[PDB]
Amino acid sequence: TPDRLQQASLPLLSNTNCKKYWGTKIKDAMICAGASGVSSCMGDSGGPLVCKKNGAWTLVGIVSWGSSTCSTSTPGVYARVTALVNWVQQTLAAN
Amino acid sequence: CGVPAIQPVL
């Protein structure tokens, strides 16, 4: 793994189109991005997928799984945060 | 939230 922090831009894809690579592995709570010449790889899991909206960065995806090779032509799979935020808001309010 | 002090350089 590199010792300095790395970054990359990558476009978001629709689940539909994503299923062309992955198929049924893609679930409603998953969001694909990438297949653009970059890719998240091992050790990136749990990290951020952010999108600037209204001037601030907002977490849209959490680094999940993908290509076993980190191929830059396959889309990465990230947890879709929009479908999990009601759980985070409930978890924070309880504890 | 989302507005870092050190602006990311993309």
Binding site: T1, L5, Q6, C41, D44, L59, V85, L92 | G2
Partner: protein
């Protein structure tokens, strides 16, 4: 990250590093506030693990990093380890993070918020750069 670039140090203030007691970087995370970190459930975080904030160069000794203890692990109970669906885990820190210029929070979207396919976003981390 394969094909990424080196970030500007401190430009992704919410980015954290999950290390085991050996000091080995095994997962990334994001700070949502000073007491909560969001990661992947599959990372398998335990309370013997540590969250490192404000770090850029992991082989540097002169950085003023914050090593935070983990109080509790909340894995979403909808998480499916067979399919890796709902792959989110929250971590409650024992010790509040000290928000600085290099330590801040990411915003959470609305369950309703729309991220259109084709939009360009950014991902970060200390994952392999080559396979």
């Amino acid at each position: 990250i394969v094909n990424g670039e080196e970030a500007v140090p401190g430009s992704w203030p919410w980015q954290v590093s999950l290390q085991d007691k050996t000091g080995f970087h095994f997962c990334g995370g994001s700070l949502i506030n000073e007491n909560w970190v969001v990661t992947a459930a599959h990372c398998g975080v335990t309370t013997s693990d540590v969250v490192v904030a404000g770090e850029f160069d992991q082989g540097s000794s002169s950085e003023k990093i914050q090593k935070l203890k983990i109080a509790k692990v909340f894995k979403n109970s909808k998480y499916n380890s067979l399919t890796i669906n709902n792959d989110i885990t929250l971590l409650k820190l024992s010790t509040a993070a000290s928000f600085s210029q290099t330590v801040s929070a990411v915003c959470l979207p609305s369950a309703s918020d729309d991220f259109a396919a084709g939009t360009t976003c950014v991902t970060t981390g200390w994952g392999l750069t080559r396979y």
